[PDB]
Ligand SMILES: Cc1cc2nc3c(=O)[nH]c(=O)nc-3n(C[C@H](O)[C@H](O)[C@H](O)COP(=O)(O)OP(=O)(O)OC[C@H]3O[C@@H](n4cnc5c(N)ncnc54)[C@H](O)[C@@H]3O)c2cc1C
C-alpha cells in the first residue's frame with residue numbers, strides 16, 4: 235500500500251524527491267534507497283497497480299487501450315502528413331508507468347546506440363564500453379514458462395544478473411517455426427538473429443519479454459515493490475506534480491527544490507522539499523510539461539502563454555521523436571491465432587481462468603512473436619539527401635513485428651477469420667516535433683505534435699517496410715499459411731503513390747515519445763540537460779526518463795530507458811558520495 239494524500243506523509247523534507255513512479259523513476263527510487271539511509275519521496279500521478287489483471291496478465295494488455303483507468307489518453311494536433319488526422323496517444327498512468335501497460339518487449343539496442351549517445355554528448359561514460367555494466371545489472375534471462383527448448387533462439391552468454399527478467403514465450407504459436415525456417419535457410423532474403431540483445435539487432439529474432447512465472451514484471455515489480463520494505467522510501471500515489479517552486483541559489487544558479495502537487499485540479503496544493511536533488515522521471519510528455527510550468531523552457535514561447543520564465547532553456551519540449559507504425563494484415567490458413575481471444579470475452583475469460591489457476595496458456599504471451607530489424611542498402615539513393623538517422627552498424631532503419639493475430643491499430647479485426655500482422659515501423663525516423671503548453675493550468679492537456687511521417691525519409695522507409703513485409707511472407711515456409719492481404723495497406727496495390735496514400739491513413743504512433751529534455755554537451759542549447767542529466771541553468775534538478783535520451787532508440791525503448799536510469803542512479807550516488 236501507498237500514501238494517497240500529503241497529510242499521511244511522515245515528513246515534508248527528504249534527501250531526494252523523484253517525480254513519476256514509471257519505467258525510470260522506480261529504478262531511481264529503488265537504487266537511491268539501497269543504503270537504507272537516503273530518504274526518497276516518490277510522487278506518482280496515477281493509481282496503484284495492485285490487483286489489476288490487465289496489468290499483471292500479459293495476454294490482457296490490449297484491454298487497457300484505448301481508454302482505461304491505468305492509461306493517460308490524449309490525441310495529437312492534426313498531423314499534416316497523415317491527412318490531418320489527430321492520432322491517439324497513450325502512456326501509463328499507474329505505478330510502473332508505461333512499463334505496466336506496454337507490450338513487454340525488451341531490446342537494449344545495438345552497441346552503436348550507446349556509442350551514438352557518447353558522440354552526441356561528448357561523454358564516453360555513455361559509450362557501450364561503459365554502459366555494458368548497466369545492462370548486465372538491469373536484467374537477466376529466465377526460462378520460458380512451459381520449459382520448451384530455446385536452443386538457437388537466445389544466447390545466455392549475452393545476458394546479465396539483474397532484476398528485470400526476460401523470457402522467451404511460455405505458450406506456442408504458429409509463427410516462430412515459420413520465422414526460423416524462412417530466415418535460417420541458406421540464402422534467406424531476411425537473415426536470422428540468434429540474440430538481438432547481444433549487440434547486433436539485424437535479422438529476425440524471437441522476442442524477449444519482461445515476463446516471469448507468466449506474469450508481467452514491470453518496473454513496479456522489479457524495482458519498487460522490493461524497495462518498499464525500506465524505512466527510507468516513501469511513495470505517494472494519486473498526486474500530480476503541478477510545478478517546481480524556486481528555492482535559494484546554489485553555486486550561482488537558481489534551484490527548484492520545492493515540489494508542488496495535488497490530487498486533482500480542485501484539490502488544495504501541497505509542497506515538499508528536497509535537500510539534495512529533485513529528479514524528474516515523469517516521462518517524455520510529463521517532464522517537459524513540469525519544466526515549462528516551472529518557468530524552465532523557451533523564454534519567448536512560455537512568456538506568450540503567460541508563464542513567468544526563470545531559466546531560458548529553449549530545448550525543453552523540442553526535438554520530440556516517436557516511431558510511426560502501420561499494420562500489414564494477412565488472412566491466414568490457420569486456426570492457431572489469438573483472434574478469438576481478442577474478439578470473444580468468454581474465450582478471453584476462460585484463458586484468464588487457466589492463467590489464474592496455474593499461470594499457463596495463451597495469457598502468458600506478449601502481443602508479438604518475433605522482431606526483425608533491417609537497414610536500407612548503404613548504396614541506397616535516399617542517402618544522397620539524408621544522413622543516416624540510425625546509430626549505424628547493428629541497428630535497423632526498419633522493424634517488422636510479427637503478431638499472431640490482427641493487432642488493432644487504426645482498424646480492429648473482422649468478426650470472422652484468422653490473421654497475422656506484420657507491423658512496419660520506422661525505428662530510425664528523421665521527423666521531429668514538439669510538446670507545448672496550451673495553458674498555465676497544470677491539469678490542462680499538453681499540445682502534442684510529433685510531426686509523424688513529415689520527413690520524406692520516414693515516408694519512403696515505411697513504404698519500403700510494407701514491401702519488405704509482403705516479401706518476407708512470400709517464401710515457401712509461409713506459402714501454406716498466408717492466404718491473402720487485407721486491411722488498409724494490404725488491400726493497396728504495390729504502386730508507391732497508392733501505398734503512400736494508404737500509409738497516410740493507416741499510420742499511427744507506437745507511443746515511444748522521446749528526447750523532449752534531452753542531453754547535450756555543456757554550452758550547447760541543442761538539449762535541455764547536460765551529459766550528467768542535470769538541467770542546464772539550474773542547480774539540484776536532474777531528468778531521468780525518456781525525455782533525457784539524445785536520440786530515439788532504433789528499437790523498443792524501455793530497455794534503453796532502464797539503462798539510462800541505472801547509470802543516472804550511479805551518477806547521483808557518486809556526486810553525493812552515498
Ligand atoms: C501501450 C504501450 C506499449 C509499449 N510497448 C513497448 C514495448 O513493448 N517495449 C518497449 O521497449 N517500449 C514500449 N513502450 C514504450 C515504453 O513503455 C516507454 O517509452 C517507457 O516505458 C517510458 O519510460 P519513462 O520512465 O520515460 O516514462 P513512464 O514509464 O511513462 O513513467 C512516467 C511516470 O510519471 C507519471 N507522471 C507523469 N506526469 C506526472 C506528474 N505531473 N506528476 C506525477 N507523476 C507524473 C506517469 O503517470 C508515469 O507513472 C510502450 C508504450 C506504451 C504506452
Ligand SMILES: COc1ccc(C(=O)O)cc1
Nearest residue numbers: 337339601602641744790
Ligand atoms: C504488436 O507488437 C508490438 C510490440 C511492441 C510495440 C512497442 O514497442 O510499442 C508495439 C507493437
